[PDB]
Amino acid sequence: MKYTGSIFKRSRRLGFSLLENNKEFSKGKKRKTIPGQHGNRFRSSTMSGYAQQLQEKQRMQYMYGITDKQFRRLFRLVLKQRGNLAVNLFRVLESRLDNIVYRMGFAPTRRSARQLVNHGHVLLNDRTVDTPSIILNPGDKVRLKAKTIKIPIVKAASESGVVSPFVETNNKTFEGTYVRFPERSELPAGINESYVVEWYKRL
Amino acid sequence: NIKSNEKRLRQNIKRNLNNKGQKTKLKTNVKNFHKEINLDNLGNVYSQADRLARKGIISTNRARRLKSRNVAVLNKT
Amino acid sequence: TVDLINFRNFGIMAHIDAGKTTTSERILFHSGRIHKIGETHDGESVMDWMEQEKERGITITSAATSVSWKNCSLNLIDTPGHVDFTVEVERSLRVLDGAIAVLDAQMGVEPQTETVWRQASRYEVPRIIFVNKMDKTGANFERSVQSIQQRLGVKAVPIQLPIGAENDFNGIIDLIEEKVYFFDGGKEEKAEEKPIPDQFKDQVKQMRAHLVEEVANFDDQLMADYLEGKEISIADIKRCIRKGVIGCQFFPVLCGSAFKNKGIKLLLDAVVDFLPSPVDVPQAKAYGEDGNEVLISASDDAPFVGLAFKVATDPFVGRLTFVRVYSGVLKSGSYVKNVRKNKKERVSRLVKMHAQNRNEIEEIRAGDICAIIGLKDTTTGETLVDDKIDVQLEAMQFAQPVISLAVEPKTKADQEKMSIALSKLAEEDPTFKTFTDPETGQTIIAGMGELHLDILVDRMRREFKVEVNVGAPQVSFRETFNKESEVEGKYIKQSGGRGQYGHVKIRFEPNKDKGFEFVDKIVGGRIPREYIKPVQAGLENAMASGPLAGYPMIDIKATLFDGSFHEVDSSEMAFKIAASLALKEAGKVCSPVLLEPIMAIEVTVPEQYFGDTMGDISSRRGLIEGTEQRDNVQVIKAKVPLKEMFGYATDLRSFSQGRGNYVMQFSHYAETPKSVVNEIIA
Amino acid sequence: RMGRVHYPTYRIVAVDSRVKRDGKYIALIGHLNPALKENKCKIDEAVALEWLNKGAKPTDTVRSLFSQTGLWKKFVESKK
RNA sequence: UCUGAGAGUUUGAUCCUGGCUCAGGAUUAACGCUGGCGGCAUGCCUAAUACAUGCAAGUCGAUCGAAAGUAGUAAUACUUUAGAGGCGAACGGGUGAGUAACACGUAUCCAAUCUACCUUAUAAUGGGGGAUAACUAGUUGAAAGACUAGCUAAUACCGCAUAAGAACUUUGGUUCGAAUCAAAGUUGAAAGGACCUGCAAGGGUUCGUUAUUUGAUGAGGGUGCGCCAUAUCAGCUAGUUGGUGGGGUAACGGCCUACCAAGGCAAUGACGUGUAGCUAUGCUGAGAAGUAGAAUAGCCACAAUGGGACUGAGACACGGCCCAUACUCCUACGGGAGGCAGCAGUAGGGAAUUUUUCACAAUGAGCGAAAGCUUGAUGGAGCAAUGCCGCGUGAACGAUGAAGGUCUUUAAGAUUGUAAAGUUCUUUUAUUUGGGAAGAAUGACUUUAGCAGGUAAUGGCUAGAGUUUGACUGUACCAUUUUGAAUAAGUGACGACUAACUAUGUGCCAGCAGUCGCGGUAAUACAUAGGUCGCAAGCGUUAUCCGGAUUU
């Protein structure tokens, strides 16, 4: 869902952070224990391998904030082109419009990246976009539509935002460019692509 | 619906009467040809068939067929 | 665009069995000259037939029938096809400019003619007094005026004079002009004015002494010329008659006959002259929708406003909405606005629906009555507008469906089609209410009268083709009884996944003061507490049925005293089944009695039918004990059973000749008399 | 135009005056998208002469582009 | 790059055959729970049941008489048509009941076919006669209207003349059931409107006319072959089969007639039975293949039904017509009218699919020299969460889990829960205002320059100048365009298969389950409170077809 509500509850259930320790900031307490009446000293009573594949898939798609309809659309579109699509799937998921906005340091979270995109604060190729389902390509210029440059939050975020080697950005003019495709190693390895790929029983 | 339906109807009623007249006026000539066969009768048949087959009454292929049927029996005389 | 002083919308209002159908249809026949109706030559061309009063009324119920005269067009409307009703009269008076009222003269009491007069007097609706049944014995002009003055005191001015008596009435004398003799019989289309003979000429002047002075009090020139004695112009007295009929100070009275068709053209001239036009009177004043409901006039200007007053079902189209326009012009195919629904209604087309035909019309001017195809969602009482003006609401009376009837449905499909018909009939007439009774399962239809319900069933069997017989209302006759021995309940059966054994003895006492009180008296350990709640629930849910007819056994207290269960057998349900059997046996043994709700009926009559009231009350074994007065009338309290009130409605209506109303409210629950009790034994 | 709603499309197609458009066809002379008119149409220019030389005169919306290309000029030479 | 995912279930325990069953999609799907949105489609799968109301295709006055009106004493010019005549009526749109077959496609032969019109092109558009619509008058009648008489014109109708060229015919030259060629016999072509010029005459320009020359186009026929189930259907067919003469079709033909003769098919199934519009194709699978043929296209059948016919190039014509069967309606009760398988709507059924929707703006068609005219064709609007897509209901900070609830029931503590409260920011949408599209500048029209036959010129060709075409649109879109977290979350399951259990009541009762199976007093299980997991403006639930299903 585009708005998961209290996502920290999922964090306690899943134990899958977002930057380093901002998902388990010990607000209340830093725990990986499962919430609910089902047990806080012992785990659940139903377990399967399909369950852990789903656990990995949900962890990754909540770190990315993917909706199921959009997820299937992206899967179908990835099936279009050829090559070693296992890692290309992860690369294009990281190439999402909100994903790239986050990688540029323009948004503290994807939750906020979608808020930035939808409100007219994102402008690509001189064509206003409110749909973050855009796959960035090497050498694509991303701007902020400086009408919204006055915001103190974005000014503070741009100077000390996330910077990745596979893109470039300027911390003071809020302008960046996607330069090259990323690599799997620099990205978190807590999820397995093959789990989701073999998990695809819809088609 | 259709603005001009009775128009062509009453237009072609009189044309149908005229066409029936010409068809029977050729029928009498072909019947006379049945009674008597000779060159002059077939010449008048040629005249009348050229007059009527020009109209939408007699088709060209039917005219050829009937004229062939007439000349086949006239060549014997 | 078009003239407005010549534009007029009136209506003929009369009682049934007083010429309503005859007067209205014959006036339409005489005054029908336009191509939309043209009833004269259309009826002359075709042979004559007749219809039953109900069928003829159905075929004469009309919305807009246009007739023409020297300068003026009249849009007559016939909504009352009943004996007489309230909602149709309300709608018509709310949607008319003036009206022509015909009084009952073959029946001296005029049982229903007074209702329309009261409705128009409350609304200050202009109307004239005219008598049709002057061609039959027992009716006279002087008799009628004296009788109405004695009964009501309406302060009317007689105008027109008959020549002769009830059977000798063959000529009519106008007051404001000379005597008009009639040169033809039927349809009265030949009337010429002769000089009045001496023997009556003085009398007219004598009445000219009266009538003129009766209109010489609210006009300066009238008073001046009457004081001088100079002859006032007839135009001035005509204007004063208009002022009085719009001002409600007096009431012109005309004489004639519509059953024998006497005095028609003079009537048309009178309704052209004295009856006001929408321009000639302050326009329709309604309460605008601004959170305050301030009364404002329509003014008959460019902006349009209107209230829907009728909606009817018709095959091949759907819903046709008869509406009266108060201001402006409505365009075919426009987008009207409904504030109560708060939506844009899509107008499809506009049509004027007549007595026997419909005529599609592009535009309808202010003051006119028409109908619309379109507006699939507009409901009763809503206001629509296409010129974007302040909408208004106006409804000056309503009615209650108090006359209730339970009809047993003879077939499931019959009940479904009854529901479909009545749901659509409510669209045509929303003043009745339809339900399915959770008490008896019959169709509960509530309206306001014998002929009204008869024509309702006639309509649903003609248009909706719903054929069903009559039913019979009933009363739930709840049950109480006497004290039981204690109880002896047993249940021993090998069922329920195991055996089942149970012995119970409680004491179950009915008393209408205290309901279900459960007492537990286990001190030696005869039963565990685990079986107390089970028997409590069993008794609580088994109290709902009785032995006489399944009616509830209410207000009974339970006191558990003894019980016994078996070894590891005998699960919980054994106790409940034993308790149910014990309660059944106890209900059978104590010979229960029934209870009905007796109602107080406040029958209202100014001692005119008090003897009839006693007779009708006593016909149902009654309670007649005395009389009491409420501040302007005498109203009698009667304690009546519910079952006999359904026929008592028409019984009271008949003996009082439709001159009595009452109220039906729950007085108290009383034990049924044995006359009701003997019907239950089987 | 045809195709998607408010999405102009008009295939330059040889069709007779007896069958509905988008129905039966003789040949596909080309394609034209009436979205923006800047002389942007796919044409063959060969079969067009055969169509003009055997009757069944083509559409009238394409006269301007034939005039700019000079299709009229190269066709009236066959009459000389 | 490509060809395949398994699981539960019978025994005291265990292997095998083997069924059931689920895990995936699409849905002329409904419907429950409700319920933001647009782009994008989709939308009687159901009574070929009957339909008021209009749309549903009408066009030509520079093709004609003939009058009304507009101007003009008048003479005269023009709008309209009451009509004639010309075209369009067969197209088109919808339906699938019939139809299992040349329906379909296939390679097709048409030594057997038509195609007005358009198109290449040859010959020319000559000379006569008589006509009725219309109009008027009478009968009768509400009209319906017919009857009777007169007057009329045409590019309307019937002769005649020449006919390059044509068919016919006899002779002379040819092909592998036929044509090519020489001469000769017979015979038949129209018509003028309008413009320029010319004293006039006449000539020239355009349209059209007539045959003729190319074609092109589709239609039709014949054929190879395939193309449902059906043996609980083995004899069947009599112009039926073979041939001959005559006749019919645009053609060939038992197509028909008359005559003679006796077949023909089928055991690889004739005939009969029930079904089905045929195909391309949709959906499923990994494929062969299966299912179906929603939107789409081609073809074909019918046009309330059964016979029948004219017209025209084109028919037995949705909406033309004659009659018969049957239906609806009006009537003056004498007589007739019409049939929405056109668009909506409607009557009914169905569980059910939207509005008695707007412009002909664009396209296309038809008619027109041309102003241009008609378009429920077409292009658009609306409605429905019906589907795909996207997208709001916020976002960062915010503690040792705020209050309260649930569990812990034991009372530590957790869950609710950074969610809260609160701080910070934010404006797609909500809200404020303006501009404002594209589509349509195509297409014709008028000025213009030149071009070629032409000349005395007028008229067609391109280059641009102008004339203009909007239901859409008040649209998309754009603009520190105003205010403002403000304008919006429901929902399947949580006993195993199969992502989700805590507590209580229930006592084989209430009930649940796709399979197994639980409830007879401790239910991981029924129900309830909470929480949880999965989706999400959707969630489910059934029928549907396929990988399982290799269970033909």
PDB file of C-alpha atoms (C1' of nucleotides) in Angstrom, chain E residues 2 57 129-130 204 247 259 326 337 355 399 402 432 450 459 493 507:
ATOM      1  C1'   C E   2      13.216 -22.305 -25.794  1.00  0.00           C
ATOM      2  C1'   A E  57     -31.162   9.089 -46.082  1.00  0.00           C
ATOM      3  C1'   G E 129     -44.418  13.153 -83.588  1.00  0.00           C
ATOM      4  C1'   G E 130     -47.562  12.862 -79.533  1.00  0.00           C
ATOM      5  C1'   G E 204     -15.533  27.834 -78.588  1.00  0.00           C
ATOM      6  C1'   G E 247     -37.244 -22.972 -74.211  1.00  0.00           C
ATOM      7  C1'   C E 259     -39.553 -37.914 -75.688  1.00  0.00           C
ATOM      8  C1'   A E 326     -51.369 -14.028 -38.095  1.00  0.00           C
ATOM      9  C1'   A E 337     -53.340   1.978 -42.051  1.00  0.00           C
ATOM     10  C1'   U E 355     -29.373   7.955 -21.358  1.00  0.00           C
ATOM     11  C1'   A E 399       8.461   7.418  24.271  1.00  0.00           C
ATOM     12  C1'   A E 402       0.532   8.590  26.115  1.00  0.00           C
ATOM     13  C1'   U E 432      -9.338  30.503  -5.971  1.00  0.00           C
ATOM     14  C1'   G E 450       0.968  32.277 -65.028  1.00  0.00           C
ATOM     15  C1'   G E 459     -13.963  28.055 -68.213  1.00  0.00           C
ATOM     16  C1'   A E 493      -9.008 -15.561   6.154  1.00  0.00           C
ATOM     17  C1'   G E 507     -21.558 -28.883  24.667  1.00  0.00           C
TER      18        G E 507
END
